[PDB]
Design an enzyme around this catalytic site. Structure first.
Site, mmCIF file in Angstrom:
data_model
loop_
_atom_site.group_PDB
_atom_site.id
_atom_site.type_symbol
_atom_site.label_atom_id
_atom_site.label_comp_id
_atom_site.label_asym_id
_atom_site.label_seq_id
_atom_site.Cartn_x
_atom_site.Cartn_y
_atom_site.Cartn_z
ATOM 1 N N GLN C 11 0.867 -1.268 -0.022
ATOM 2 C CA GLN C 11 0.009 0.001 -0.159
ATOM 3 C C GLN C 11 0.864 1.236 -0.011
ATOM 4 O OE1 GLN C 11 -2.837 0.299 3.137
ATOM 5 N NE2 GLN C 11 -3.740 1.940 2.536
ATOM 6 N N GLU C 71 -3.250 -6.946 -1.903
ATOM 7 C CA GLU C 71 -4.657 -6.726 -1.909
ATOM 8 C C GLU C 71 -5.173 -5.576 -2.742
ATOM 9 O OE1 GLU C 71 -6.144 -3.576 -0.318
ATOM 10 O OE2 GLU C 71 -4.038 -2.510 -0.438
ATOM 11 N N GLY C 144 3.485 -5.930 5.862
ATOM 12 C CA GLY C 144 3.554 -7.432 5.514
ATOM 13 C C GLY C 144 3.909 -7.710 3.631
ATOM 14 N N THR C 145 2.898 -6.829 3.084
ATOM 15 C CA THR C 145 3.377 -7.266 1.600
ATOM 16 C C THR C 145 4.548 -6.441 1.286
ATOM 17 O OG1 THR C 145 1.020 -6.946 1.098
ATOM 18 C CG2 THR C 145 2.533 -6.553 -0.671
ATOM 19 N N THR C 179 2.611 2.476 13.028
ATOM 20 C CA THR C 179 1.567 2.035 12.700
ATOM 21 C C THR C 179 1.121 0.683 13.384
ATOM 22 O OG1 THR C 179 1.847 3.342 10.620
ATOM 23 C CG2 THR C 179 -0.002 1.370 10.655
ATOM 24 N N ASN C 206 8.258 8.327 8.321
ATOM 25 C CA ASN C 206 7.439 9.377 8.262
ATOM 26 C C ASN C 206 7.486 10.469 9.252
ATOM 27 O OD1 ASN C 206 5.936 8.155 6.017
ATOM 28 N ND2 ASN C 206 4.557 7.158 7.297
ATOM 29 N N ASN C 228 3.924 11.480 0.723
ATOM 30 C CA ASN C 228 4.228 10.879 -0.560
ATOM 31 C C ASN C 228 4.287 12.111 -1.578
ATOM 32 O OD1 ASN C 228 3.307 8.439 0.341
ATOM 33 N ND2 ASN C 228 1.014 8.528 -0.099
ATOM 34 N N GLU C 254 26.121 5.989 -11.724
ATOM 35 C CA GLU C 254 27.218 7.212 -11.675
ATOM 36 C C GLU C 254 27.038 7.397 -10.102
ATOM 37 O OE1 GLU C 254 28.884 9.427 -13.825
ATOM 38 O OE2 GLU C 254 29.176 7.929 -15.176
HETATM 39 N N1 LIG Z 1 5.320 7.201 2.784
HETATM 40 C C1 LIG Z 1 4.349 6.517 3.098
HETATM 41 N N2 LIG Z 1 4.034 5.595 3.671
HETATM 42 C C2 LIG Z 1 3.064 4.840 3.959
HETATM 43 C C3 LIG Z 1 1.871 5.336 3.314
HETATM 44 N N3 LIG Z 1 0.678 4.634 3.763
HETATM 45 C C4 LIG Z 1 1.199 3.505 4.436
HETATM 46 N N4 LIG Z 1 2.717 3.638 4.706
HETATM 47 C C5 LIG Z 1 3.471 3.147 5.375
HETATM 48 O O1 LIG Z 1 3.071 1.810 5.867
HETATM 49 C C6 LIG Z 1 3.238 1.375 7.082
HETATM 50 C C7 LIG Z 1 2.394 0.256 7.472
HETATM 51 O O2 LIG Z 1 2.274 -0.840 6.618
HETATM 52 P P1 LIG Z 1 0.926 -1.544 6.177
HETATM 53 O O3 LIG Z 1 -0.253 -0.760 6.636
HETATM 54 O O4 LIG Z 1 0.824 -2.855 6.394
HETATM 55 O O5 LIG Z 1 1.038 -1.120 4.446
HETATM 56 P P2 LIG Z 1 2.081 -2.230 3.777
HETATM 57 O O6 LIG Z 1 3.541 -1.728 4.000
HETATM 58 O O7 LIG Z 1 1.802 -1.668 2.217
HETATM 59 O O8 LIG Z 1 1.876 -3.666 3.619
HETATM 60 P P3 LIG Z 1 0.428 -4.209 3.553
HETATM 61 O O9 LIG Z 1 -0.559 -3.502 4.182
HETATM 62 O O10 LIG Z 1 0.551 -5.673 3.683
HETATM 63 O O11 LIG Z 1 0.424 -3.863 1.891
HETATM 64 C C8 LIG Z 1 3.136 2.416 7.767
HETATM 65 O O12 LIG Z 1 4.389 2.452 8.733
HETATM 66 C C9 LIG Z 1 3.722 3.604 6.937
HETATM 67 O O13 LIG Z 1 4.992 4.228 7.038
HETATM 68 C C10 LIG Z 1 1.805 6.353 2.621
HETATM 69 O O14 LIG Z 1 0.911 6.821 1.928
HETATM 70 N N5 LIG Z 1 2.969 7.173 2.342
HETATM 71 N N1 LIG Z 2 36.335 23.364 -16.958
HETATM 72 C C1 LIG Z 2 35.285 22.362 -17.218
HETATM 73 N N2 LIG Z 2 35.430 21.404 -16.332
HETATM 74 C C2 LIG Z 2 34.351 20.513 -16.212
HETATM 75 C C3 LIG Z 2 33.035 20.533 -17.315
HETATM 76 N N3 LIG Z 2 32.420 19.776 -17.030
HETATM 77 C C4 LIG Z 2 32.712 18.778 -16.290
HETATM 78 N N4 LIG Z 2 33.828 19.358 -15.671
HETATM 79 C C5 LIG Z 2 34.563 18.774 -14.686
HETATM 80 O O1 LIG Z 2 34.803 17.378 -14.645
HETATM 81 C C6 LIG Z 2 34.688 16.829 -13.452
HETATM 82 C C7 LIG Z 2 33.845 15.503 -13.576
HETATM 83 O O2 LIG Z 2 34.157 14.940 -14.573
HETATM 84 P P1 LIG Z 2 32.982 13.936 -15.304
HETATM 85 O O3 LIG Z 2 31.835 14.314 -15.844
HETATM 86 O O4 LIG Z 2 32.596 12.710 -14.198
HETATM 87 O O5 LIG Z 2 33.828 13.131 -16.527
HETATM 88 P P2 LIG Z 2 33.193 11.762 -17.402
HETATM 89 O O6 LIG Z 2 32.703 11.015 -16.463
HETATM 90 O O7 LIG Z 2 34.405 11.379 -18.157
HETATM 91 O O8 LIG Z 2 32.106 12.422 -18.288
HETATM 92 C C8 LIG Z 2 34.205 18.077 -12.565
HETATM 93 O O9 LIG Z 2 34.875 17.864 -11.241
HETATM 94 C C9 LIG Z 2 34.162 19.162 -13.418
HETATM 95 O O10 LIG Z 2 34.764 20.018 -12.709
HETATM 96 C C10 LIG Z 2 33.319 21.801 -18.208
HETATM 97 O O11 LIG Z 2 32.472 22.055 -19.418
HETATM 98 N N5 LIG Z 2 34.373 22.520 -18.165
HETATM 99 MG MG LIG Z 3 -1.766 -3.658 2.553
#
Ligand SMILES: Nc1nc2c(ncn2[C@@H]2O[C@H](COP(=O)(O)OP(=O)(O)OP(=O)(O)O)[C@@H](O)[C@H]2O)c(=O)[nH]1
Ligand SMILES: Nc1nc2c(ncn2[C@@H]2O[C@H](COP(=O)(O)OP(=O)(O)O)[C@@H](O)[C@H]2O)c(=O)[nH]1
Ligand SMILES: [Mg+2]
Ligand SMILES: Nc1nc2c(ncn2[C@@H]2O[C@H](COP(=O)(O)OP(=O)(O)O)[C@@H](O)[C@H]2O)c(=O)[nH]1
Ligand SMILES: [Mg+2]
EC number: 3.6.5.-
Lengths: 91, 430, 439, 137, 92, 82, 429
Positions: C11, C71, C144-145, C179, C206, C228, C254
């Site tokens: 859920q 569910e 649980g799920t 919960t 949460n 959410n 990366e």
């Molecule tokens: N971030 C977020 N967490 C949610 C939400 N709804 C439920 N939860 C989380 O779900 C936990 C409770 O678990 P459940 O009620 O059993 O829901 P579930 O994890 O999907 O498990 P099932 O009910 O068996 O499907 C709570 O601790 C919440 O953190 C939501 O809308 N947003």
């Molecule tokens: N001078 C300059 N440096 C750059 C530019 N783009 C990225 N860098 C440098 O390149 C470093 C990261 O390199 P990266 O993007 O991972 O290289 P790649 O993985 O081979 O594509 C960073 O520390 C930046 O400072 C640019 O357009 N000009």
């Molecule tokens: Mg459920």
């Protein structure tokens, strides 16, 4: 503004049906945004509250609602969308 | 006739080469359309050094692009002068480099080095007189370091007698934006030492310092950084491409700057470099050229020239200027700071004059120096590599693609020997 | 090229994936129907959607996602909601009865009759991908799920696809708020899967998100919707490096290579900033130094774990938006000079940076405000030993007297599995201490 | 200041144009290319998509030459303007320049804009109040 | 509840009202897309007349419903199902 | 045209000829022989008639009105190289 | 002077249709046979591949052969399909059935009388018939069986006439039947005995060229047939047009067949490049030679590196100097002497034709005898012995008027040819 009024009425009817189905309270969600209890929240506040309630509304409709209730009168919005505990018919 | 074939390894090398071809086409009057629009015959006189003519009269660069990712290939192609490059020179793989020297040198780079060498051999055969292979890459990356080292290694046997320039971007702690700088740089330097007849180290920290204090720029992108690198990368071939009162080339530079085979690591500098506000106020002269040329803030290394002593140096002066004056200014700087130079290798500096200055510049100079303070960067890289290697961290990645600890130990020993050579020649006495 | 397959187990995983995909659709301009309108254009780099959305002949974009649950409530909610025309009818696998919050039930009895078609759907998704970069599985080890079926599916994926990248975004149990009572058992038992068959594990508990939203978003009563949405923002920030062009581009392997020093040590805590209030107008555009300092501050962290008790081993920072490398490097230098945080001796550099030119996108009615720049952290640090200490001390406390173990025994698991799970967690804590120890 | 004012109001919004780039007569093996010339209004910068990215993030000069920005003297970069100066004022194409029926000098090649989207039409009507010409074949 | 259009409408996306009725557009999209049926214009006209007797003839090809002014609930759908079953049954 | 073709800068050599042998920092005038000196040092081979015409056009008059043996090289530099 | 073409099987018929595509394009012939060329050189040798009618229409000297009329119907439905004679469409009611037995012995031989009749008519029409050309596939039923039977009959009737064949042999990556080993084995010895020169084409190499070189996305049989037709038309350029050093069809045979059994060649065309990459490739003799001797450019799926070139012939077309077309061959021989037979230095004929292909300034066709052509015969022999050891699919052949020992004879003939190629590859002075 007949077209705007009709669109607002249709949007309010849809939200009324959704809120009646969900039986959900909007006052705490909307009033958390009103820190000073002045009855006014901004358009972003109204948008976040409606998205919280998952009301079936889009961005354009929702901005239109904010402009119609203009800040937003969230109290009047909740009154119009209506609830068993909170409706125009309650009073 | 005499010409240079360029290779661009990694995204760093690819973008640096893209800006280098920006600058070169600017000098030679070539629009992205590939035709010639220059106002001088001198541009066409030696345009075959970096370009090859096509059926329609257009000019195509002699560039080979190299990266295990196609993203930088697409970016370079979409660049303003990306239409110049041959699509069959775009050699790329589906799987990314993974930022691993082993990936770029042994497994992913091995399967592409065949095509890369095919393209390079085709270019070399098409060229009338091969003179040099220039490579642009970063030693801190995965494919810029590993694949570039592999390419130069396999090129060495094929063409043993041709010049090998490498433009290696060695990272700095202030610009350290990865965690495998020590491993990659250590595994690359030992290849460069015996596989490049002149290596040229570029340090991002120092180019950034140039942009901050020498140019006074607040928020610059990689554009002017690659422009700074391309300035010297193009000024090196100034006497190659244009006439002058004292001509030179890659081998003149190497013969006059490499006293011993293992000492071929150079630091670069460009003059003049002034902010727009002070551009009109400063009087451009050879005095200012030399003063900025022998200053650390103009150097492209985070290495301190005071702590080192220039074994050899070279100033490629571009523009119409007087030979006695340039030579006597080099004599004057030597006499003023004899301690900053080496006693047993007299006439440390190499003055070479090119008639054609850079467009929009009255006069300029590019400085290539074999100063000892490269041992500082080698020592810092070795210290970081030892710190990582003792605790074995991030080594299972490298051992995954078939490398063993013996290669790492050999690379560390090679770097230690390289830094010890500079240490010996720093305090060597007559 | 650069395709990544998303899997959502349980859920929690299903809801997290729902938020992730509702973010991705509006980020790439793809409507919930599955089409890109020609009226307006949202993105400039075409094929950027190829990582998460596969092109169809008619012109639509089908997500490369597998919503697998035992569910049917959440899967039916997805089939009814606005994304029904977006998601394929298959890769939307719903079982008949839930795993009953039982790792043994989800891994041995009910998961064995669902993992076969789960893997069939994964294979049908992967064969389309000609440049697949990895798998990104969202689940919660508390349930649980997500624990049992997650372990089974991760094992099968590891044995089938070899050494391809695997990012497990797991909602670990939180130190105080919880919960369920079997949550510690599920967390401890799922550690086998999260160690041997998970390349990088991302903790998303949460309490940290609740504390982030109570303070930096001015929301007195947030919910799983906000949780959410923040998780999806983190995921989008991570994947934007390969989705869109940027100054520094990073990919799955990366950052995995720079982030995992040892095969066992692959648990990374996350933090995101600027989480600025969209409720708040007048917000000054935060600088790169400011957002970096906020990220390094434990207040703006997605994991309830104070790094001051430990030391960072490898920090990866994704800077989305208009970001200057010198703003980044000044921030990094100031961070290194700052003494309240410590690194390990054997990793001097310890900083990986990736700059992307795409600013974060805002969902309709979202707590997050439209910002030029943002930065997300993936930090491998030795401080994450404390959450394991909490969870396994709780496990020992509840296990010393055979509580809640007859369910696991009767659902087809041996008693020694608990003992070996506890031993494995103890070994994980021991080697975390060893790698954090000074040389 | 003005940068994030534009990021808030004009930020992230985009003007598409459909264009034809004819290269048949220019060189052997020339092909007519269908392109999307697309302008970010926050930065006021164009990119070209070949329908496949023909041109990346850049400001496209009116003269068609970026030589003065490539000028080796670093006068092309201004501290407060992300847009290169080019040394002459109003040197880069703008939204007021972009229109249906216009031949853009993209880096030395003529790209003829034959169509625009309804969002671009509405944006021009709302801001500048100019009716873009109807699409041409 | 609506066909694909330039509008970014939840009505054309799903049924946001979450109401227990079938509109003409909903039935048309159901027949075409989830039932894998491709009736012609006359066939679909007959189907729409059978399901919604009071729907105007001009509204058969409309691209959007007028809310819920023309709809059939569960009981009406079951009655129509029983009529289609009668067509299979022997005459009574 | 030759100047923008060959990147010609006669200003420094002409300035040096103005200030050579002379304690005067600048006089903004120079002799015809030194003007030909500057052109030759910049390697601009010109016919003697062309050189005479140029120096006659750019010469500075003596106070009495007769032509002098000096050339106003500053105006030549300003007109030629912008 | 004249070359008369015969086109067997579906592969042969479609390839010949594209060949006449190319020939009509080169000689300015409409679909209606009316001349529309802009130069007199087209009419000056139009008669080589065409015969004039009473009304001036130019009909191809082509004969079509297939036991299935569907391919004939498709050819007539084609754009230049109306150009052929109607009586040359000699077809059978019952299909070839992908069986060499009834493509060569019973159904093929029953119908081959009419194709010999029309071939005789064409030979009589020709003023001085230079030779015969055939186009077919060795893996099919009628392309292999009836093609070999026509080759044998025409060899018996005209002993002293060059007889080209263009055989499309299969590859593991392309195999779309189960009886390539049988059909190819039964056809190779017939080609060895009865053909002066046999030119091998492989769809795998065609696809590799279409993707790696032409940068295409959906390259079809039309594109493959255009690629093979380019070489087919470049073979006879020196016959159809003047040049500083021309060559008849027997020039190639005499300078590329050192021994009677060694007359199997590999094809190659240049320039070959994508539509977008023509901008940079400088059309020159050096680049032509490089792409000519490039292994991947070979449109027969074999690696010339693994073998040694017996002989080679480069037919250049266009306005180019003789100095480079000679010096490039000398350079390639000197700097790749390890890839050429030592006891024959100067292995390469170079022929020059003045007229280049339409749309190009210069071009070249490569005709090459290399010992690496033995690898494909070896793999086909391994497949054949694997199927033959267990009498697999053999009842179809044996029941249709064949015998057991002839399969062994054909296998022995292939093995002898492979052995000859190997013993000339490893031979030393
Ligand atoms: N971030 C977020 N967490 C949610 C939400 N709804 C439920 N939860 C989380 O779900 C936990 C409770 O678990 P459940 O009620 O059993 O829901 P579930 O994890 O999907 O498990 P099932 O009910 O068996 O499907 C709570 O601790 C919440 O953190 C939501 O809308 N947003
Ligand atoms: N001078 C300059 N440096 C750059 C530019 N783009 C990225 N860098 C440098 O390149 C470093 C990261 O390199 P990266 O993007 O991972 O290289 P790649 O993985 O081979 O594509 C960073 O520390 C930046 O400072 C640019 O357009 N000009
Ligand atoms: Mg459920
Ligand atoms: N190059 C090319 N090859 C073809 C074409 N048509 C068929 N082939 C090849 O011919 C083989 C089948 O030959 P087939 O038609 O059965 O020969 P037939 O039975 O004698 O008519 C296949 O392996 C194809 O690769 C074509 O148009 N071009
Ligand atoms: Mg010299």
């Amino acid at each position: 503004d007949a077209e705007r009024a009709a669109q607002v009425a249709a949007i309010l009817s849809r939200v009324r049906h959704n809120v009646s189905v969900h039986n959900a309270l909007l006052m705490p969600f909307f009033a958390d945004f009103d820190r000073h209890h002045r009855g006014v929240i901004t358009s972003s506040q109204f948008a976040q509250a409606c998205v919280r309630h998952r009301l079936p509304l889009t961005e354009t409709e929702m901005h239109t609602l904010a402009s119609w209730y203009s800040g937003v009168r969230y109290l009047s919005f909740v009154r119009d969308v209506g609830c068993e505990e909170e409706s125009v018919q309650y009073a | 006739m005499r010409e240079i074939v360029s290779c661009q390894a990694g995204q760093c090398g690819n973008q640096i080469g893209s800006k280098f071809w920006e600058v070169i086409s600017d000098e030679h009057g070539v629009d992205p359309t590939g035709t010639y629009q220059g106002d001088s015959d001198l541009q066409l006189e030696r345009i075959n050094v970096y370009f090859d003519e096509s059926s329609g009269g257009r000019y195509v660069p002699r560039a080979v692009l190299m990266d295990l990712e196609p993203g930088t290939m697409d970016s370079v192609r979409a660049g303003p002068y990306g239409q110049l490059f041959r699509p069959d020179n775009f050699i790329f793989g589906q799987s990314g480099a993974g930022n691993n020297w082993a990936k770029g040198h042994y497994t992913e780079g091995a399967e592409l080095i065949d095509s890369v060498l095919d393209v390079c051999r085709k270019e070399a055969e098409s060229c009338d007189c091969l003179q040099g292979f220039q490579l642009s890459h970063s030693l801190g990356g995965g494919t810029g370091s590993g694949m570039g080292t592999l390419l130069i290694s396999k090129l060495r046997e094929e063409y043993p007698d041709r010049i090998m320039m490498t433009f290696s971007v060695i990272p700095s702690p202030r610009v350290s934006d990865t965690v495998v700088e020590p491993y990659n740089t250590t595994l690359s330097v030992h290849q460069l030492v015996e596989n490049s007849d002149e290596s040229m180290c570029i340090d991002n920290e120092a180019l950034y310092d140039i942009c901050f204090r020498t140019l006074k720029l607040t928020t610059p992108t990689f554009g002017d950084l690659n422009h700074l690198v391309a300035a010297v990368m193009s000024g090196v071939t100034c006497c190659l491409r244009f006439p002058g009162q004292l001509n030179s080339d890659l081998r003149k530079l190497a013969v006059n700057l490499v006293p011993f085979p293992r000492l071929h690591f150079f630091m670069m500098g460009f003059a003049p470099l002034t902010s727009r506000g002070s551009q009109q106020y400063r009087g451009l002269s050879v005095a200012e050229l030399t003063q900025q040329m022998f200053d650390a803030k103009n150097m492209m290394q985070a290495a301190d020239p005071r702590h080192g002593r220039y074994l050899t140096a070279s100033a490629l002066f571009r523009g119409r200027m007087s030979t006695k004056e340039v030579d006597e200014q080099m004599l004057n700087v030597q006499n003023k700071n004899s301690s900053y130079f080496i006693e047993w290798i007299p006439n440390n500096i190499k003055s070479s004059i090119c008639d054609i200055p850079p467009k929009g510049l009255k006069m300029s100079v590019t400085f290539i120096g074999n100063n000892t303070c490269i041992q500082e960067m080698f020592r810092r890289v070795g210290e970081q590599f030892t710190g990582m290697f003792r605790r074995k961290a991030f080594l299972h990645w490298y051992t995954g693609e078939g490398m063993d600890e013996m290669e790492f130990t050999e690379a560390e020993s090679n770097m230690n020997d390289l830094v010890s050579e500079y240490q010996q020649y720093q305090d060597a006495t007559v | 090229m650069r395709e990544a397959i998303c899997i959502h187990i349980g859920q929690a995983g299903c809801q997290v994936g729902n938020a992730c995909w509702e973010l991705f659709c509006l980020e790439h301009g793809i409507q919930p129907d599955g089409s890109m309108p020609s009226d307006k254009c949202i993105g400039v780099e075409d094929d950027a959607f190829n990582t998460f959305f596969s092109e169809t002949g008619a012109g639509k974009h089908v997500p490369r996602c597998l919503f697998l649950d035992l569910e049917p409530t959440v899967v039916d909610e997805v089939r009814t909601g606005t994304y029904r025309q977006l998601f394929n009818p298959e890769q939307l696998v719903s079982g008949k009865e839930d795993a009953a919050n039982n790792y043994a039930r989800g891994h041995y009895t009910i998961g064995k009759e669902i993992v076969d078609l789960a893997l069939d759907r994964i294979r049908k998704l992967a064969d389309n991908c000609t440049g697949l970069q990895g798998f990104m599985v969202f689940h919660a080890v508390g349930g649980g799920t997500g624990s049992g079926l997650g372990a089974l599916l991760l094992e099968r994926l590891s044995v089938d696809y070899g050494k391809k990248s695997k990012l497990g975004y797991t909602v670990y149990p939180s130190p105080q708020v919880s919960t369920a009572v079997v949550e510690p058992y599920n967390c401890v038992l799922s550690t086998h899967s999260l160690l041997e068959h998970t390349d990088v594990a991302t903790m998303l508990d949460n309490e940290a998100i609740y504390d982030l939203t109570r303070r930096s978003l001015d929301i007195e009563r947030p919910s799983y919707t906000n949780v959410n949405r923040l998780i999806g923002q983190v995921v989008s920030s991570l994947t934007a490096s390969l989705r869109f062009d940027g100054a520094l581009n990073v990919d799955l392997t990366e950052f995995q290579t720079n982030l995992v020093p040892y095969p066992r040590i692959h648990f990374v805590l996350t933090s995101y900033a600027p989480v600025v209030s969209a409720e708040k107008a007048y917000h000054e555009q935060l600088s790169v130094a400011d957002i970096t300092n906020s990220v390094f501050e434990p207040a703006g962290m997605l994991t309830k774990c104070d790094p001051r008790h430990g030391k960072y081993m490898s920090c990866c920072l994704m800077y989305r938006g208009d970001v200057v490398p010198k703003d980044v490097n000044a921030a990094i230098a100031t961070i290194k000079t700052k003494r309240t945080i410590q690194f390990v001796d054997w990793c001097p550099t310890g900083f990986k940076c990736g700059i992307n030119y795409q600013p974060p996108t805002v969902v309709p009615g979202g707590d997050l405000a439209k910002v030029q720049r943002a930065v997300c952290m993936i930090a491998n640090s030795t401080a994450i030993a404390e959450v394991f200490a909490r969870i396994d001390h709780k496990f020992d406390l509840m296990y010393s007297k055979r509580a809640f173990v007859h369910w696991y025994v009767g659902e087809g698991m041996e008693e020694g599995e608990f003992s070996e799970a506890r031993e494995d967690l103890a070994a994980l804590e021991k080697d975390y201490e060893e790698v954090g120890a000074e040389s | 200041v003005e940068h994030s004012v534009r990021f808030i109001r004009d930020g992230g919004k985009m003007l598409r144009f459909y264009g034809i780039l004819d290269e048949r007569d220019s060189f052997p093996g020339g092909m007519v290319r269908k392109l999307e010339v697309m302008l970010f209004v926050e930065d006021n910068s164009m990119a070209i998509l070949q329908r496949g990215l023909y041109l990346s993030r850049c400001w496209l000069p009116r003269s068609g030459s970026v030589a003065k920005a490539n000028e080796l003297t670093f006068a092309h970069r201004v501290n407060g303007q992300r847009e290169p100066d080019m040394g002459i004022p109003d040197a880069y194409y703008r939204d007021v320049d972009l229109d249906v029926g216009v031949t853009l000098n993209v880096f030395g090649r003529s790209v003829l804009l034959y169509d625009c989207d309804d969002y671009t039409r509405e944006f021009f009507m709302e801001r500048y109040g100019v009716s873009l010409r109807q699409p041409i074949d | 509840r609506a066909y694909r259009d330039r509008r970014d409408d939840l009505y054309s996306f799903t049924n946001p009202d979450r109401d227990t009725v079938i509109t003409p557009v909903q039935l048309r999209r159901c027949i075409v897309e989830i039932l894998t049926g491709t009736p012609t214009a006359e066939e679909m006209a007959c189907l729409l007349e059978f399901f919604f007797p009071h729907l105007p003839a001009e509204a058969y090809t409309q691209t959007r419903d007028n809310g819920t002014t023309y709809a059939v609930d569960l009981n009406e759908f079951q009655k129509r199902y029983y009529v289609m079953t009668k067509e299979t049954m022997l005459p009574d | 045209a030759l100047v923008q073709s060959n990147r010609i800068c006669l200003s420094p050599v002409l300035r040096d000829f103005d200030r050579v042998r002379k304690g005067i920092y600048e006089h903004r005038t120079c002799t015809r022989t030194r003007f030909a000196r500057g052109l030759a040092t910049q390697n601009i081979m010109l016919p003697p008639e062309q050189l005479q015409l140029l120096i006659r056009k750019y010469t500075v008059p003596n106070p009495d009105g007769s032509p002098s043996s000096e050339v106003n090289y500053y105006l030549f530099v300003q007109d030629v190289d912008p």
